[PDB]
Design a protein around this nucleic acid. Structure first.
Lengths: 147, 51, 125, 128, 187, 51, 225
RNA sequence: GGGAGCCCGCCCCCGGAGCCCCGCGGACGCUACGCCGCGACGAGUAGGAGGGCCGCUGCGGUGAGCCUUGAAGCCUAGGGC
RNA sequence: GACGUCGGCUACCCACCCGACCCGUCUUGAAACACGGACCAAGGAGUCUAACACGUGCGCGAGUCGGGGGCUCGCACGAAA
RNA sequence: AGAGGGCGUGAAACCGUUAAGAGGUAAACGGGUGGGGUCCGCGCAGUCCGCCCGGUUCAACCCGGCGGCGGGUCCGGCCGUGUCGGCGGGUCCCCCGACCGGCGACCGGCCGCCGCCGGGCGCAUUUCCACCGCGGCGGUGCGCCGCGACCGGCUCCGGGAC
């Protein structure tokens, strides 16, 4: 809204809020990212370190599908299954230990972040972390690998 | 869950008949003139032809 | 409630009137014609209104029943008083004070009735 | 035998002369409407002695008599009889001013109603 | 003729909320009256927090509220949060609580009501304890936003761990001259 | 003036539902209806349900 | 219930009246004691002087414990250190006076701002007139006139100062709470010196008004206050 | 509640004690984005911010708005804010 | 004091005393022997799109979203909802 | 045609004419007055009123009717929130019994109060209209003024006493 914009309060002011000693010239400093090495080096080195120079190996035909691998932590693992599944756990005097399919929920790798409740569970996933496997074993479950 | 009164149904010639309806909670929903005005002013810009 | 609708209506009312720094409200049953929370007949559960008589002599007192809202047809009850310019004021005073029906509006309604009665008489030479 | 105000305080004004634009006398294209001088070398802007006076907040009139007519009432612009009845409880301090566009036929009725309600009109005998 | 610097004579603290919603303004009126009448500073703190903007009252998580109520001493006390209470999915055991907040998420509300807890609004809290007796005042992490990760000492400065503004993190967008020891220098 | 000015505005579905619910709720409360200029003095009941 | 409540209210009012009468009596007794103490001090100084002059001896009077300082020049073109000392002495506006107790640090500060101030040793009448005619207290960071002793009692009750007489005594005979009394006292906005000045820009010794004018500061107070 | 004091009993309620405080109900003051009371201060280019019941145009609502018994516009040695 | 007498601060003309150099801009410095300028009327210059950063308001909340498409209408209001 | 064929409204620069005023330091401007005109608001005194007090009917009090407000024994029935119960049909529905919040979510009787209408109430009450009191209160005076007492802020003067 031009009504709420600043230009309405600048009516009558000669310089229109852009100084009068140095006028608002068209492009005093250079267009765009001009002078990354010259006359803007201080800014480019104190606000964008690592802008200039190459590093690493080139990969011509890169595909994100090959490296696609979503991760889920043990911090939020029972959220993938219904709450009644966990209700029917630590009960029945049988040791049901239900199966939670991570791939069905939409993750491939299971990570060890977070605390796991004391309830056995069968975790099926493509990849497992060492700490996540240790947590599952300590809780009393089993890690299952799937393709 | 506020108290919902009973709304009588009026016939074609007034003279409210015996039919009554429990007042829906939509009428007990909170009033927000700011939200109403915001939505109205933003949606009035959708039927505007370019010039 | 009343505060909710007052917050809704304090500035977007059709009866609100600006234009030379005085804000009034023209909705009925509003003593002193003041756009104030206390002086507003639409929002409050108990409202008193003083109006000139349709015939031209006497005054009309309008009371909000509070028995049932959402029914504007029967919400307000009107009574006509045509007495000797002092019994009307006494009747309004007893209506507002003895019934404990919005005592804040007592003197305002008395003044409005006095103004109406003064208006309904021969004007001048 | 007009309508007296409720109170008649002594209206005191700090300044009554209108503020005029700088160099409004020299040129016709410059109106009397005041605009603040915004030049680097301007006597009025920096308040040199003997120049025109720049309006300031100091010239603000007293709140007691602000917007008060010499008669002692405050104007309220009335367009029709329905709007006239609003001033019923404010007749002792507010006066009805009939809108210019109002026809004479309705103006007469407005004047008569205001006379009945004891509300002062600043332009009662205007159209005729 | 007095030398007084008017640079900071005007205090910039808020006086009324900038929001135009009516329920918050009614709560503001109620707590203004309570603060100006009662001698308790709880009402004043609640009024000041109601005046605060959205970013100044971050939401409080259910797990954080649980861990703050589990501290010894605040047993059977009502929790007062001026922000909003949000459900936490990584917590299973939720004891019953007494929570006062402007808003509660649907999931958190369901959890609290299923656990046997009670949820109150600010007007109900004023009716119950006008001076805020038996209340535990809690708030969310102010520095929880990712905005504050970009604040502080600028990147490219020694002993600075500030996240720079990058269009997209990657191999060839940063970690070059200025960050690699093999390319120029590093900080 | 150019044709590709951002004429249209996007509003959240939840916000639109909130606004319409508030409008339906304020359809009650005869004070607001009268203040909106609608003359409902003789209406038997503001939630006017007909057969 | 009604009569019992009325009787209790009357009893409380009577107790308040008796307490106020007792406080008034205490104020009267304190003022009379202060009068006696002032007379004793004035008489004993002359007694010591006469005693010293009786034999081949001299009596050197004590250096004054407090001094009155008035800023005589404006705020335009002031050195940073001079301005800092002036604003530490609560002398911001021209023709403002403030009581300052004298010690090494105070004398050094007054020496630093010597060209910008005129200071001396105020008399008892000068203190009385300054406290009475132009005495304002700082209550809730607000300059409020000392129209009644209630304000002084509320502000300096913890220090044994409950009236104008106690305040004047603590200001004149520098005591333990002189700092608190002087900080409570708002700086005196004295008027322009009637009859003019000799010279603002030069020291008092060389015909000007700036510097130390120990006894003539009383004349300056009479011309300004 | 018990024991008693410089023969016993009351020592009462505002639909009325009549008021410089009445905790029984409470404005002429309450457009609480309102009203009211104290102090201190008021320079200003470049520049920033806030309030405009300042002004122009068109749109959605609203004034049972104005108007051929005279609209906008224009002129004015008239009354004004 | 009341049928040629009253009040009109403001605006019409005139006289007197004091003050008072022509506006905008570059400039440390403008009344300048620095530049633009006879006068008047109309037009006239910080906009829009996209990408960001911060702050504020609203909705939902470890979730959030409508991009695109489809189902309701013959489009008055709708290319809306 | 005060719309007369480039003719609706007809402004400013500029010009001609009528009326008034003025005019040897170019003109013009700000502050303060004075003089003359333009009309404006008064008056053929403007002593502005608004309450209380003194010198044709009904309130007061009853009868009948109607309407309204408040209240509790929750009186009786609905309504309605939290819990307990019939498991009666994870979230969503009915019954009687109990407690609590009895919540402005509604009614039927009861009481108290108020208002209106119709009857009595004929005149020490009642209300109007006008006057002689400037008697009590409040804001005010049509214009020009004068005086008195109190206070605050100042410049002074005459005394006495240490």
């Amino acid at each position: 809204p031009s009504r709420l914009r600043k230009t309405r309060k600048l009516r009558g002011h000669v310089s229109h809020g852009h100084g009068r000693i140095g006028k608002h010239r068209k492009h005093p400093g250079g267009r765009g990212n001009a002078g990354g090495m010259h006359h803007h080096r201080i800014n480019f080195d104190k606000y964008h370190p690592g802008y200039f120079g190459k590093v690493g190996m080139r990969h011509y035909h890169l595909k994100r599908n090959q490296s696609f691998c979503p991760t889920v932590n043990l911090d939020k693992l029972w959220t993938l299954v219904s709450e009644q599944t966990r209700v029917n756990a630590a009960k029945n005097k049988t040791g049901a230990a239900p199966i939670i399919d991570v791939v069905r929920s939409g993750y491939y790798k299971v990570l060890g972040k977070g605390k796991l409740p004391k309830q056995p569970v069968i975790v099926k996933a493509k990849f497992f972390s060492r700490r996540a496997e240790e947590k599952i074993k300590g809780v009393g479950g089993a890690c299952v690998l799937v393709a | 869950a506020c108290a919902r009164p009973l709304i009588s149904v009026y016939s074609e010639k007034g003279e409210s008949s015996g039919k009554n309806v429990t007042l829906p909670a939509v009428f007990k929903a909170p009033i927000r003139p700011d939200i109403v005005n915001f939505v109205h002013t933003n949606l009035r810009k959708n039927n505007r032809q370019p010039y | 409630s009343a505060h909710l609708q007052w917050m809704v209506v304090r500035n977007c009312s059709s009866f609100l009137i600006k234009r030379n720094k005085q804000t009034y409200s023209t909705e009925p049953n509003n003593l002193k014609a003041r756009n104030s929370f206390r002086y507003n007949g639409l929002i409050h559960r108990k409202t008193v209104g003083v109006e000139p008589a349709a015939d031209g002599k006497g005054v009309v007192v309008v009371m909000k029943r509070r028995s049932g809202q959402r029914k504007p047809a029967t919400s307000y009850v009107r009574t006509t008083i045509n007495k000797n310019a002092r019994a009307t004021l006494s009747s309004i005073r007893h209506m507002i004070r003895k019934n404990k029906y919005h005592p804040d509006l007592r003197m305002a309604a008395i003044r409005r009735a006095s103004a109406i009665l003064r208006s309904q008489k021969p004007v001048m030479v | 035998a007009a309508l007296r105000p409720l109170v008649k305080p002594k209206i005191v004004k700090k300044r009554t002369k209108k503020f005029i634009r700088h160099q409004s006398d020299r040129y016709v294209k410059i109106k009397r409407n005041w605009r603040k001088p915004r030049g680097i070398d301007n006597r009025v802007r920096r308040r040199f002695k003997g120049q025109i006076l720049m309006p300031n907040i100091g010239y603000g009139s007293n709140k007691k008599t602000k917007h008060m007519l010499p008669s002692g009432f405050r104007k309220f612009l009335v367009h029709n009889v329905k709007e006239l009845e609003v001033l019923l409880m404010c007749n002792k301090s507010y006066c009805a001013e009939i809108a210019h566009n109002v026809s004479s036929k309705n103006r007469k009725a407005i004047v008569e109603r205001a006379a009945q309600l004891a509300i002062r009109v600043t332009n009662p005998n205007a159209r005729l | 003729g007095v030398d007084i610097r008017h640079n900071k004579d005007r205090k910039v603290r808020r006086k009324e909320p900038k929001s135009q919603d009516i329920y918050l303004r009614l709560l503001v009126k109620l707590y203004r009256f309570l603060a100006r009448r009662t001698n308790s500073t709880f009402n004043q703190v609640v009024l000041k927090r109601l005046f605060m903007s959205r970013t100044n009252r971050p939401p409080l998580s259910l797990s954080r509220m649980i861990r703050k109520m589990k501290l010894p001493g605040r047993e059977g006390k009502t929790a007062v949060v001026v922000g909003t209470i949000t459900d936490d999915v990584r917590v299973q055991e939720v004891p019953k609580l007494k929570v006062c907040a402007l808003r509660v998420s649907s999931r958190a509300r369901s959890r609290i009501l299923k656990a046997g807890g009670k949820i109150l609004t600010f007007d109900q809290l004023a009716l119950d304890s006008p001076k805020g007796c038996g209340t535990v005042l809690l708030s969310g992490p102010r520095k929880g936003r990712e905005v504050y990760r970009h604040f502080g000492k600028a990147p490219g400065t020694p002993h600075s761990h500030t996240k720079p503004y990058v269009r997209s993190k990657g191999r060839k967008f940063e970690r070059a001259r200025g960050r690699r020891a093999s390319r120029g220098y590093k900080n | 003036t150019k044709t590709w000015r951002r004429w249209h505005r996007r509003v959240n579905t939840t916000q639109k539902r909130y606004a319409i619910c508030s409008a339906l709720a304020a359809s009650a409360l005869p004070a607001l209806v009268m203040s909106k200029g609608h003359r409902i003095e003789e209406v038997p009941e503001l939630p006017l349900v007909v057969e | 219930n009604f009569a019992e409540l009325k009787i209790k209210r009357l009893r409380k009012k009577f107790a308040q009246k008796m307490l106020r009468k007792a406080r008034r009596k205490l104020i009267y007794e304190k003022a009379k004691h202060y009068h006696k103490e002032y007379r004793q001090m004035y008489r004993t100084e002359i007694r010591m002087a006469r005693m010293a002059r009786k034999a081949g001896n001299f009596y050197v009077p004590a250096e004054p414990k407090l001094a009155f300082v008035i800023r005589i020049r404006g705020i335009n073109g002031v050195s940073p250190k001079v301005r800092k000392v002036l604003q530490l002495l609560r002398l911001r506006q021209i023709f403002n006076g403030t009581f300052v107790k004298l010690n090494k640090a105070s004398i050094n500060m007054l020496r630093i701002v010597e060209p910008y101030i005129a200071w001396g040793y105020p008399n008892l009448k000068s203190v009385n007139e300054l406290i009475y005619k132009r005495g304002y207290g700082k209550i809730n960071k607000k300059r409020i006139a000392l129209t009644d002793n209630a304000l002084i009692a509320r502000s300096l009750g913890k220090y044994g100062i409950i009236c104008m007489e106690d305040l004047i005594h603590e200001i004149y005979t520098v005591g333990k709470r002189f700092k608190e009394a002087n900080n409570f006292l708002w700086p005196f906005k004295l008027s322009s010196p009637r009859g003019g000045m000799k010279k603002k820009t030069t020291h008092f010794v060389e015909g000007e008004d700036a510097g130390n004018r120990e006894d003539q500061i009383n004349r300056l107070i009479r011309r300004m206050n």
